Write a protein that binds this DNA or RNA. Sequence first.
DNA 1: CAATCGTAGGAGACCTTTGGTCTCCCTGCAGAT
DNA 2: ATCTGCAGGGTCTGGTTCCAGACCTACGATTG
Lengths: 163, 163
Amino acid sequence: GWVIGVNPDIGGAIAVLSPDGSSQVFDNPFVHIVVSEVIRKRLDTKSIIQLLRGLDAPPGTTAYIEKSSPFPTDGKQGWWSTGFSYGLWIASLVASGFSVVPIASQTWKAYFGLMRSETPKDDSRQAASILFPDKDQSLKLKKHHGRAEALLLAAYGKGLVLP
Amino acid sequence: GWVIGVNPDIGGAIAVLSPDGSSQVFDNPFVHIVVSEVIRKRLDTKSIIQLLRGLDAPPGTTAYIEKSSPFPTDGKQGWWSTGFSYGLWIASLVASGFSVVPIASQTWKAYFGLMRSETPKDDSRQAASILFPDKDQSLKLKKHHGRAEALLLAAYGKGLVLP
DNA sequence: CAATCGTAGGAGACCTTTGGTCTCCCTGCAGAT
DNA sequence: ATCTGCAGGGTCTGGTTCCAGACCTACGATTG
Ligand SMILES: [Mg+2]
Ligand SMILES: [Mg+2]
């Protein structure tokens, strides 16, 4: 049936797969906010809830979400932001009636044979373009790898196979 | 005029103040989760949303929430968990129809004259007991300071004053 | 169960398989074209 | 604007133009 895949971080996206084969992918809504006298991007909570409420996916649809797992060498702001983005998305999905299933990036990458790639973000856009050819135009920029990763997480959840 | 005050961390609480002067305070629901082969406490998303849905406070009620601000010397896990709990609560409150207003701890502490105390958690329980005497029995343990801080945040938002 | 103390910390999936091995980002800021 | 590269970082309020002063939290463990 329906499958949702969420790539939750600031350059992420939510992909929605319908039973008739169609797909949608939306960039994560964000806002600019002032923190410690500089500008930071933060997810836009109201817009995410509005987006989820507008989906045709019925209550109980599984929403796969990529599990938050920053490196010990990443900065503490990286740790805070990945936690924040994860919590915001999990509560939004639960409140909107979806069944949240966290998935490690290694899981869907291994499924599509994408591990240890020299060009992982390019490879993600290529794989997503082949699985979802009507999204090829929406994946033409390097910055679209977040869209590709959400689509691939959803594709994993739906059991799709590359040709 | 209803007022909600949320102390969002793992030992926190949500306080609800009604226009008739009554109050409720609920410990934050949590679950035990496995992470890196050890047990960690994490907020319980479903129980938080269920709790919010059961409140009598009408949509549009303001929910003051204590702003997340860990120290630079706190560990990266502390940074992740304060971010996660903050995001989970913000999305839960917005999805439940409440108007979220972040408040720094310094703001409500200064308002009640609590800064630079030798016993800050005891003083919070004492101040909350004086503002909400029918919660005195619910504030008598040292571990109840999370409840006290949620009540004081709500009291700040309502404009209450100590005698 | 409740209180207290002290430092500030990866996490996850699958193999080699009851421990071992290998994998994975993310943010924040500056720069160039 | 899009991309690229590199290191891994506090933040907030009241008082102004930056300063001064203030604030936790988590994750372990132990003791009764
Ligand atoms: Mg991502
Ligand atoms: Mg707190």
